[PDB]
Amino acid sequence: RSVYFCGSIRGGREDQALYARIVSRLRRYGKVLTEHVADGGDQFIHEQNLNWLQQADVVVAEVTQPSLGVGYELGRAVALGKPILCLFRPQSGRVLSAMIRGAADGSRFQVWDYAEGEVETMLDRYFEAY
Amino acid sequence: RSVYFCGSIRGGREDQALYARIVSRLRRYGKVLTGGDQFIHEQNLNWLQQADVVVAEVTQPSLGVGYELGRAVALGKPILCLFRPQSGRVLSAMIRGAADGSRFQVWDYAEGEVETMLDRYFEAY
Ligand SMILES: O=P(O)(O)OC[C@H]1O[C@@H](n2cnc3c(NC4CCCC4)ncnc32)[C@H](O)[C@@H]1O
Ligand SMILES: O=P(O)(O)OC[C@H]1O[C@@H](n2cnc3c(NC4CCCC4)ncnc32)[C@H](O)[C@@H]1O
């Protein structure tokens, strides 16, 4: 089973520690294809990621930090019909993009509010139901 | 003929005045098309499917602008991305790496140059 994890890089690395926790937890549920997010130029990066996205069985995104790449990955993922879980922290004090919040089906595309400490329990809840 | 314009909102409205200028200039080249959030998403995707060209100002990081570009690429839309390196920011590798120089172009520009960059692209067309 393949999992594609999305999180901000050039959008900012403020949530890196949280990304590492998410990736560690995701390894219980499959192979994390994009593990370097939590640590040939741009063309290669893009194509390598697109190939991984096509292979992935599920896409998990932490969407608290605004990022073009995370948004782009989610857009491509929806077009591929992938099951998507977005995780957002309201305590950040920001309001989540209407385009992400509004993409929610509440089934194939889920957007869940969580508190920083609960990330592991949220992922367990999703992958128990998956 | 019809144009979808993308720019950061909840990502930050720092460049809002610039966006307005982009939109004014786009009017010469086509019709600019652009629960609560569910409706906004549905409306925008409808416009995106109808669009003949997609233009995005990608200087301010934004999930929504990224998502629009992802959806637009999957639909094979011609895409122009405009980026300001004098902002001090480095552009997303996923956006820059998506470019192919034809159906997906990324153009670096300086403050005051945006209209001429638009004129060139739409004169291609
Ligand atoms: O850099 P932004 O915040 O626009 O996008 C981050 C998202 O887009 C993908 N991404 C962005 N830059 C990446 C990247 N960059 C290289 C590794 C560090 C410097 C260049 N490598 C792999 N994936 C990348 C990641 O999977 C991540 O989820
Ligand atoms: O809000 P972010 O920065 O994630 O995304 C902005 C992009 O996504 C679309 N968008 C986001 N919020 C929108 C919106 N209303 C939101 C609901 C209250 C104000 C913002 N109305 C129309 N389009 C919107 C725009 O076309 C814009 O290009």
mmCIF file of C-alpha atoms and ligand atoms in Angstrom:
data_model
loop_
_atom_site.group_PDB
_atom_site.id
_atom_site.type_symbol
_atom_site.label_atom_id
_atom_site.label_comp_id
_atom_site.label_asym_id
_atom_site.label_seq_id
_atom_site.Cartn_x
_atom_site.Cartn_y
_atom_site.Cartn_z
ATOM 1 C CA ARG A 1 0.000 0.000 0.000
ATOM 2 C CA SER A 2 1.345 3.430 -1.046
ATOM 3 C CA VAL A 3 0.761 6.750 0.769
ATOM 4 C CA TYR A 4 1.618 10.188 -0.686
ATOM 5 C CA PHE A 5 2.224 12.834 1.984
ATOM 6 C CA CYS A 6 2.016 16.585 1.210
ATOM 7 C CA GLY A 7 3.355 19.432 3.364
ATOM 8 C CA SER A 8 4.792 22.908 2.804
ATOM 9 C CA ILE A 9 8.459 23.360 1.867
ATOM 10 C CA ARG A 10 8.985 26.643 -0.011
ATOM 11 C CA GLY A 11 5.670 27.771 1.479
ATOM 12 C CA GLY A 12 7.601 27.675 4.800
ATOM 13 C CA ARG A 13 8.947 24.947 7.120
ATOM 14 C CA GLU A 14 7.245 26.037 10.365
ATOM 15 C CA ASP A 15 5.364 22.699 10.716
ATOM 16 C CA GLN A 16 8.311 20.342 9.883
ATOM 17 C CA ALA A 17 8.234 18.627 13.289
ATOM 18 C CA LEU A 18 4.547 17.857 12.816
ATOM 19 C CA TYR A 19 5.237 16.504 9.299
ATOM 20 C CA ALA A 20 7.862 14.106 10.768
ATOM 21 C CA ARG A 21 5.296 12.837 13.300
ATOM 22 C CA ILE A 22 2.737 12.342 10.544
ATOM 23 C CA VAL A 23 5.213 10.457 8.330
ATOM 24 C CA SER A 24 6.292 8.232 11.248
ATOM 25 C CA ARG A 25 2.660 7.327 11.955
ATOM 26 C CA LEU A 26 1.864 6.762 8.263
ATOM 27 C CA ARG A 27 4.547 4.050 8.050
ATOM 28 C CA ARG A 28 2.180 1.775 10.055
ATOM 29 C CA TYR A 29 -0.354 1.948 7.201
ATOM 30 C CA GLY A 30 1.867 1.768 4.099
ATOM 31 C CA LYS A 31 4.958 2.860 2.215
ATOM 32 C CA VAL A 32 5.316 6.639 2.448
ATOM 33 C CA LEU A 33 6.460 7.655 -1.028
ATOM 34 C CA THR A 34 7.217 11.301 -0.143
ATOM 35 C CA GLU A 35 9.172 10.862 3.109
ATOM 36 C CA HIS A 36 11.616 13.695 2.278
ATOM 37 C CA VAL A 37 8.919 16.387 2.895
ATOM 38 C CA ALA A 38 9.387 15.742 6.657
ATOM 39 C CA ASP A 39 13.204 16.075 6.729
ATOM 40 C CA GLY A 40 17.680 17.035 -11.975
ATOM 41 C CA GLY A 41 16.180 20.346 -10.935
ATOM 42 C CA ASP A 42 12.524 21.328 -10.650
ATOM 43 C CA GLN A 43 11.472 19.348 -13.751
ATOM 44 C CA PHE A 44 12.721 16.100 -12.212
ATOM 45 C CA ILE A 45 11.160 16.863 -8.831
ATOM 46 C CA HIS A 46 7.813 17.501 -10.531
ATOM 47 C CA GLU A 47 7.869 14.312 -12.641
ATOM 48 C CA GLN A 48 9.102 12.133 -9.772
ATOM 49 C CA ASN A 49 6.247 13.443 -7.606
ATOM 50 C CA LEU A 50 3.604 13.036 -10.349
ATOM 51 C CA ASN A 51 4.681 9.396 -10.832
ATOM 52 C CA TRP A 52 4.440 8.794 -7.077
ATOM 53 C CA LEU A 53 1.037 10.498 -7.001
ATOM 54 C CA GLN A 54 -0.254 8.218 -9.797
ATOM 55 C CA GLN A 55 0.965 5.136 -7.896
ATOM 56 C CA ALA A 56 -0.379 6.224 -4.511
ATOM 57 C CA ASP A 57 -3.439 4.533 -3.007
ATOM 58 C CA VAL A 58 -4.135 7.464 -0.622
ATOM 59 C CA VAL A 59 -3.015 11.115 -0.359
ATOM 60 C CA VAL A 60 -2.549 12.759 3.047
ATOM 61 C CA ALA A 61 -1.934 16.524 3.247
ATOM 62 C CA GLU A 62 -1.223 18.837 6.182
ATOM 63 C CA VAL A 63 -2.770 22.084 4.843
ATOM 64 C CA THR A 64 -2.214 24.514 7.743
ATOM 65 C CA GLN A 65 0.754 26.346 6.155
ATOM 66 C CA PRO A 66 -0.222 27.885 2.823
ATOM 67 C CA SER A 67 1.769 26.357 -0.063
ATOM 68 C CA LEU A 68 1.461 26.351 -3.870
ATOM 69 C CA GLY A 69 2.950 22.866 -4.171
ATOM 70 C CA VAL A 70 0.627 21.277 -1.586
ATOM 71 C CA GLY A 71 -2.367 22.857 -3.339
ATOM 72 C CA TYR A 72 -1.057 21.692 -6.721
ATOM 73 C CA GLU A 73 -0.584 18.147 -5.468
ATOM 74 C CA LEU A 74 -4.167 18.119 -4.152
ATOM 75 C CA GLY A 75 -5.486 19.416 -7.485
ATOM 76 C CA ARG A 76 -3.690 16.729 -9.471
ATOM 77 C CA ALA A 77 -4.790 14.123 -6.900
ATOM 78 C CA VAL A 78 -8.489 15.037 -7.242
ATOM 79 C CA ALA A 79 -8.204 14.834 -11.040
ATOM 80 C CA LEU A 80 -6.731 11.320 -10.630
ATOM 81 C CA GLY A 81 -9.653 10.293 -8.366
ATOM 82 C CA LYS A 82 -7.388 9.565 -5.353
ATOM 83 C CA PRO A 83 -8.821 9.317 -1.835
ATOM 84 C CA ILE A 84 -7.608 12.416 0.029
ATOM 85 C CA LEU A 85 -7.309 13.377 3.694
ATOM 86 C CA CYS A 86 -6.435 16.992 4.496
ATOM 87 C CA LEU A 87 -5.506 17.885 8.069
ATOM 88 C CA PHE A 88 -5.892 21.493 9.274
ATOM 89 C CA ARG A 89 -5.250 23.217 12.644
ATOM 90 C CA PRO A 90 -7.772 25.991 13.449
ATOM 91 C CA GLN A 91 -5.640 27.061 16.466
ATOM 92 C CA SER A 92 -3.100 28.343 13.919
ATOM 93 C CA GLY A 93 -5.408 31.383 13.765
ATOM 94 C CA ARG A 94 -5.709 31.229 9.974
ATOM 95 C CA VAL A 95 -8.812 30.395 7.952
ATOM 96 C CA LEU A 96 -8.319 27.487 5.537
ATOM 97 C CA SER A 97 -8.578 28.195 1.798
ATOM 98 C CA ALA A 98 -12.163 27.997 0.522
ATOM 99 C CA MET A 99 -10.854 25.908 -2.417
ATOM 100 C CA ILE A 100 -9.560 23.203 -0.076
ATOM 101 C CA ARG A 101 -12.375 23.390 2.481
ATOM 102 C CA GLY A 102 -14.874 23.430 -0.420
ATOM 103 C CA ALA A 103 -13.298 20.489 -2.283
ATOM 104 C CA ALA A 104 -14.531 18.267 0.545
ATOM 105 C CA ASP A 105 -16.930 15.481 -0.385
ATOM 106 C CA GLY A 106 -16.850 14.196 3.177
ATOM 107 C CA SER A 107 -15.928 10.828 1.605
ATOM 108 C CA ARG A 108 -13.359 10.717 -1.234
ATOM 109 C CA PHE A 109 -12.034 14.170 -0.160
ATOM 110 C CA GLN A 110 -12.052 14.735 3.601
ATOM 111 C CA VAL A 111 -10.892 17.849 5.467
ATOM 112 C CA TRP A 112 -10.489 17.345 9.220
ATOM 113 C CA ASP A 113 -9.806 20.020 11.842
ATOM 114 C CA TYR A 114 -7.392 18.854 14.565
ATOM 115 C CA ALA A 115 -5.280 20.013 17.505
ATOM 116 C CA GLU A 116 -1.480 19.575 17.194
ATOM 117 C CA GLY A 117 -1.346 16.845 19.895
ATOM 118 C CA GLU A 118 -4.069 14.725 18.235
ATOM 119 C CA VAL A 119 -2.339 14.081 14.879
ATOM 120 C CA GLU A 120 -1.599 10.387 15.564
ATOM 121 C CA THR A 121 -5.124 9.661 16.800
ATOM 122 C CA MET A 122 -6.604 11.400 13.693
ATOM 123 C CA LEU A 123 -4.506 9.296 11.304
ATOM 124 C CA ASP A 124 -5.470 6.120 13.210
ATOM 125 C CA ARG A 125 -9.147 7.087 12.891
ATOM 126 C CA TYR A 126 -8.854 7.611 9.120
ATOM 127 C CA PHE A 127 -6.848 4.452 8.367
ATOM 128 C CA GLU A 128 -9.039 2.330 10.655
ATOM 129 C CA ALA A 129 -11.994 3.449 8.477
ATOM 130 C CA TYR A 130 -10.004 3.209 5.206
ATOM 131 C CA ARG B 1 -11.442 34.283 -25.466
ATOM 132 C CA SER B 2 -12.329 33.514 -21.839
ATOM 133 C CA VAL B 3 -9.727 33.778 -19.078
ATOM 134 C CA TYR B 4 -9.567 32.388 -15.552
ATOM 135 C CA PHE B 5 -7.340 34.473 -13.217
ATOM 136 C CA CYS B 6 -5.739 32.988 -10.043
ATOM 137 C CA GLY B 7 -4.295 34.932 -7.103
ATOM 138 C CA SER B 8 -3.870 34.465 -3.350
ATOM 139 C CA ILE B 9 -6.739 35.431 -1.048
ATOM 140 C CA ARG B 10 -6.621 33.437 2.241
ATOM 141 C CA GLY B 11 -2.965 32.800 1.436
ATOM 142 C CA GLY B 12 -2.576 36.569 1.996
ATOM 143 C CA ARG B 13 -3.791 39.640 0.050
ATOM 144 C CA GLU B 14 -0.400 41.457 -0.106
ATOM 145 C CA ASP B 15 -0.532 41.524 -3.945
ATOM 146 C CA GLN B 16 -4.260 42.423 -4.265
ATOM 147 C CA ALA B 17 -3.608 45.768 -6.015
ATOM 148 C CA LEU B 18 -1.353 44.034 -8.546
ATOM 149 C CA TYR B 19 -4.051 41.410 -9.228
ATOM 150 C CA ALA B 20 -6.581 44.153 -10.047
ATOM 151 C CA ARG B 21 -4.125 45.566 -12.584
ATOM 152 C CA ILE B 22 -3.581 42.114 -14.116
ATOM 153 C CA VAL B 23 -7.365 41.640 -14.432
ATOM 154 C CA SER B 24 -7.863 45.065 -16.060
ATOM 155 C CA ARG B 25 -5.196 44.202 -18.653
ATOM 156 C CA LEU B 26 -6.634 40.702 -19.270
ATOM 157 C CA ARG B 27 -9.962 42.337 -20.241
ATOM 158 C CA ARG B 28 -8.375 43.370 -23.578
ATOM 159 C CA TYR B 29 -7.720 39.755 -24.508
ATOM 160 C CA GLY B 30 -10.878 37.997 -23.311
ATOM 161 C CA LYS B 31 -13.767 37.646 -20.890
ATOM 162 C CA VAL B 32 -12.307 37.371 -17.373
ATOM 163 C CA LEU B 33 -14.466 34.707 -15.726
ATOM 164 C CA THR B 34 -13.304 35.111 -12.136
ATOM 165 C CA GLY B 35 -21.777 25.238 2.034
ATOM 166 C CA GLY B 36 -20.374 28.719 1.429
ATOM 167 C CA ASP B 37 -17.001 27.248 0.492
ATOM 168 C CA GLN B 38 -18.629 24.274 -1.314
ATOM 169 C CA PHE B 39 -20.449 26.739 -3.572
ATOM 170 C CA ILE B 40 -17.283 28.778 -4.197
ATOM 171 C CA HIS B 41 -15.392 25.627 -5.218
ATOM 172 C CA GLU B 42 -18.217 24.413 -7.502
ATOM 173 C CA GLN B 43 -18.529 27.862 -9.145
ATOM 174 C CA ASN B 44 -14.761 28.182 -9.697
ATOM 175 C CA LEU B 45 -14.418 24.679 -11.198
ATOM 176 C CA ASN B 46 -17.279 25.475 -13.595
ATOM 177 C CA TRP B 47 -15.430 28.621 -14.689
ATOM 178 C CA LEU B 48 -12.134 26.715 -14.978
ATOM 179 C CA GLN B 49 -13.653 24.078 -17.287
ATOM 180 C CA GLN B 50 -15.015 26.903 -19.497
ATOM 181 C CA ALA B 51 -11.737 28.845 -19.584
ATOM 182 C CA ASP B 52 -9.572 28.960 -22.707
ATOM 183 C CA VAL B 53 -6.521 30.241 -20.757
ATOM 184 C CA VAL B 54 -5.518 30.265 -17.092
ATOM 185 C CA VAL B 55 -3.324 33.061 -15.698
ATOM 186 C CA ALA B 56 -1.923 32.897 -12.175
ATOM 187 C CA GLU B 57 0.195 35.335 -10.183
ATOM 188 C CA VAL B 58 2.176 32.866 -8.046
ATOM 189 C CA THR B 59 4.396 35.146 -5.923
ATOM 190 C CA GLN B 60 2.323 34.753 -2.720
ATOM 191 C CA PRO B 61 2.121 31.118 -1.558
ATOM 192 C CA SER B 62 -1.504 29.937 -1.634
ATOM 193 C CA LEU B 63 -3.201 26.520 -1.417
ATOM 194 C CA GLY B 64 -6.081 27.733 -3.577
ATOM 195 C CA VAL B 65 -3.938 29.065 -6.414
ATOM 196 C CA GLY B 66 -1.921 25.824 -6.354
ATOM 197 C CA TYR B 67 -5.085 23.726 -6.417
ATOM 198 C CA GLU B 68 -6.513 25.739 -9.324
ATOM 199 C CA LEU B 69 -3.272 25.184 -11.288
ATOM 200 C CA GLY B 70 -3.359 21.445 -10.490
ATOM 201 C CA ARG B 71 -6.980 21.143 -11.644
ATOM 202 C CA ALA B 72 -6.176 23.277 -14.722
ATOM 203 C CA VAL B 73 -3.133 21.173 -15.724
ATOM 204 C CA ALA B 74 -5.199 17.963 -15.476
ATOM 205 C CA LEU B 75 -7.702 19.613 -17.855
ATOM 206 C CA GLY B 76 -4.963 20.437 -20.403
ATOM 207 C CA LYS B 77 -5.544 24.199 -20.129
ATOM 208 C CA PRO B 78 -2.936 26.641 -21.441
ATOM 209 C CA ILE B 79 -1.405 28.199 -18.316
ATOM 210 C CA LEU B 80 0.595 31.406 -17.686
ATOM 211 C CA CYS B 81 2.224 31.814 -14.258
ATOM 212 C CA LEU B 82 3.791 35.157 -13.305
ATOM 213 C CA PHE B 83 6.403 35.347 -10.521
ATOM 214 C CA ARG B 84 8.292 38.293 -8.902
ATOM 215 C CA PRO B 85 11.790 37.268 -7.828
ATOM 216 C CA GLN B 86 12.396 40.717 -6.222
ATOM 217 C CA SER B 87 9.843 39.642 -3.593
ATOM 218 C CA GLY B 88 12.767 37.711 -2.050
ATOM 219 C CA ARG B 89 10.835 34.440 -2.342
ATOM 220 C CA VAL B 90 11.852 31.265 -4.205
ATOM 221 C CA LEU B 91 8.991 29.771 -6.249
ATOM 222 C CA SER B 92 7.622 26.289 -5.493
ATOM 223 C CA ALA B 93 9.594 23.587 -7.353
ATOM 224 C CA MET B 94 6.212 21.978 -8.191
ATOM 225 C CA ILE B 95 5.035 25.119 -10.002
ATOM 226 C CA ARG B 96 8.345 25.876 -11.721
ATOM 227 C CA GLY B 97 8.830 22.153 -12.479
ATOM 228 C CA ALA B 98 5.364 21.912 -14.073
ATOM 229 C CA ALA B 99 6.421 24.317 -16.846
ATOM 230 C CA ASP B 100 7.143 23.061 -20.350
ATOM 231 C CA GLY B 101 7.610 26.370 -22.171
ATOM 232 C CA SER B 102 4.414 25.930 -24.247
ATOM 233 C CA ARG B 103 1.100 24.914 -22.571
ATOM 234 C CA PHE B 104 2.591 25.696 -19.124
ATOM 235 C CA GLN B 105 4.744 28.845 -18.929
ATOM 236 C CA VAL B 106 6.325 30.488 -15.885
ATOM 237 C CA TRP B 107 7.597 34.026 -16.458
ATOM 238 C CA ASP B 108 9.747 35.973 -13.981
ATOM 239 C CA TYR B 109 8.987 39.718 -13.975
ATOM 240 C CA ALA B 110 9.884 42.932 -12.125
ATOM 241 C CA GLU B 111 7.483 45.440 -10.581
ATOM 242 C CA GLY B 112 6.172 47.620 -13.435
ATOM 243 C CA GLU B 113 6.702 44.954 -16.113
ATOM 244 C CA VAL B 114 3.496 42.892 -15.678
ATOM 245 C CA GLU B 115 1.386 44.459 -18.486
ATOM 246 C CA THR B 116 4.109 43.963 -21.104
ATOM 247 C CA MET B 117 4.509 40.315 -19.983
ATOM 248 C CA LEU B 118 0.767 39.794 -20.438
ATOM 249 C CA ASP B 119 0.740 41.577 -23.823
ATOM 250 C CA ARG B 120 3.496 39.306 -25.140
ATOM 251 C CA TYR B 121 1.819 36.047 -24.091
ATOM 252 C CA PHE B 122 -1.627 36.931 -25.454
ATOM 253 C CA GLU B 123 -0.083 38.268 -28.676
ATOM 254 C CA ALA B 124 1.451 34.785 -29.256
ATOM 255 C CA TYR B 125 -1.323 33.867 -28.688
HETATM 256 O O1 LIG C 1 7.560 23.939 -1.932
HETATM 257 P P1 LIG C 1 5.986 24.067 -1.783
HETATM 258 O O2 LIG C 1 5.610 24.461 -0.278
HETATM 259 O O3 LIG C 1 5.360 24.967 -2.789
HETATM 260 O O4 LIG C 1 5.432 22.591 -2.041
HETATM 261 C C1 LIG C 1 5.624 21.498 -1.147
HETATM 262 C C2 LIG C 1 5.000 20.213 -1.748
HETATM 263 O O5 LIG C 1 5.424 19.997 -3.133
HETATM 264 C C3 LIG C 1 6.406 18.943 -3.210
HETATM 265 N N1 LIG C 1 7.777 19.516 -3.276
HETATM 266 C C4 LIG C 1 8.100 20.822 -3.282
HETATM 267 N N2 LIG C 1 9.432 20.958 -3.331
HETATM 268 C C5 LIG C 1 9.958 19.727 -3.361
HETATM 269 C C6 LIG C 1 11.264 19.254 -3.415
HETATM 270 N N3 LIG C 1 12.277 20.144 -3.436
HETATM 271 C C7 LIG C 1 13.699 19.781 -3.544
HETATM 272 C C8 LIG C 1 14.197 19.178 -2.227
HETATM 273 C C9 LIG C 1 14.537 20.379 -1.342
HETATM 274 C C10 LIG C 1 14.996 21.479 -2.315
HETATM 275 C C11 LIG C 1 14.529 21.064 -3.717
HETATM 276 N N4 LIG C 1 11.462 17.917 -3.430
HETATM 277 C C12 LIG C 1 10.430 17.060 -3.410
HETATM 278 N N5 LIG C 1 9.165 17.491 -3.371
HETATM 279 C C13 LIG C 1 8.905 18.812 -3.336
HETATM 280 C C14 LIG C 1 6.365 18.178 -1.865
HETATM 281 O O6 LIG C 1 5.831 16.846 -2.035
HETATM 282 C C15 LIG C 1 5.467 19.018 -0.930
HETATM 283 O O7 LIG C 1 4.291 18.334 -0.481
HETATM 284 O O1 LIG C 2 -7.835 31.610 -0.657
HETATM 285 P P1 LIG C 2 -6.528 31.019 -1.312
HETATM 286 O O2 LIG C 2 -5.333 31.920 -1.278
HETATM 287 O O3 LIG C 2 -6.259 29.609 -0.707
HETATM 288 O O4 LIG C 2 -6.959 30.729 -2.866
HETATM 289 C C1 LIG C 2 -7.222 31.778 -3.761
HETATM 290 C C2 LIG C 2 -7.686 31.258 -5.129
HETATM 291 O O5 LIG C 2 -8.809 30.352 -4.975
HETATM 292 C C3 LIG C 2 -10.038 31.035 -5.332
HETATM 293 N N1 LIG C 2 -10.809 31.508 -4.141
HETATM 294 C C4 LIG C 2 -10.484 31.370 -2.853
HETATM 295 N N2 LIG C 2 -11.423 31.936 -2.094
HETATM 296 C C5 LIG C 2 -12.356 32.440 -2.893
HETATM 297 C C6 LIG C 2 -13.548 33.134 -2.689
HETATM 298 N N3 LIG C 2 -14.035 33.454 -1.474
HETATM 299 C C7 LIG C 2 -13.434 33.089 -0.174
HETATM 300 C C8 LIG C 2 -14.542 33.100 0.897
HETATM 301 C C9 LIG C 2 -14.389 34.399 1.705
HETATM 302 C C10 LIG C 2 -13.304 35.218 1.000
HETATM 303 C C11 LIG C 2 -12.444 34.169 0.283
HETATM 304 N N4 LIG C 2 -14.265 33.495 -3.775
HETATM 305 C C12 LIG C 2 -13.860 33.220 -5.008
HETATM 306 N N5 LIG C 2 -12.731 32.561 -5.233
HETATM 307 C C13 LIG C 2 -11.964 32.168 -4.196
HETATM 308 C C14 LIG C 2 -9.652 32.256 -6.190
HETATM 309 O O6 LIG C 2 -9.980 32.037 -7.584
HETATM 310 C C15 LIG C 2 -8.147 32.455 -5.973
HETATM 311 O O7 LIG C 2 -7.407 32.476 -7.217
#
